[PDB]
Amino acid sequence: AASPSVEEKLQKLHSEIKFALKVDSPDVKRCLNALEELGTLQVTSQILQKNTDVVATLKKIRRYKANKDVMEKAAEVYTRLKSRGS
Numbered sequence: 001a002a003s004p005s006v007e008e009k010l011q012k013l014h015s016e017i018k019f020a021l022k023v024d025s026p027d028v029k030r031c032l033n034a035l036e037e038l039g040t041l042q043v044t045s046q047i048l049q050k051n052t053d054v055v056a057t058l059k060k061i062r063r064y065k066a067n068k069d070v071m072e073k074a075a076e077v078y079t080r081l082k083s084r085g086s
Contacts, residue, residue, distance in 0.1 A: 006041045007051065013038045014054050017061065020070065028067040031074070035061075039077035048085040055081065 013034040020031030038054075041047075048055065058081070061074035 006043060006047050009037065009041060010043070010047070010051055010054060013041075014051075014057065017057055017074075021061070021064075026066055028070050031061060031067075031070045035070075035073040035077045039073075039080050042084065043081045044084045045086040048081060 016030050016034035017038075020027045020029075020034065043051065043054075055078070058074055058078040061070050062078050064070040064074065
């Protein structure tokens, strides 16, 4: 059946990553869930080049100190994107 494209899904995932880093109310699980979908999404160079700002945020959470898990999942995901891009 039809399903939304990676970039369409990315709109949600990127937003969840950002909501998970709310200073007022951070939510690690929210980031992890977004990261894990993003980790399986085909963010190949076609999508990656039009979504460089996402890669920019992924670099921020890979060093996240307020929650270790966020940094780990961001890392596993971010590295996987490099394995699909150019």
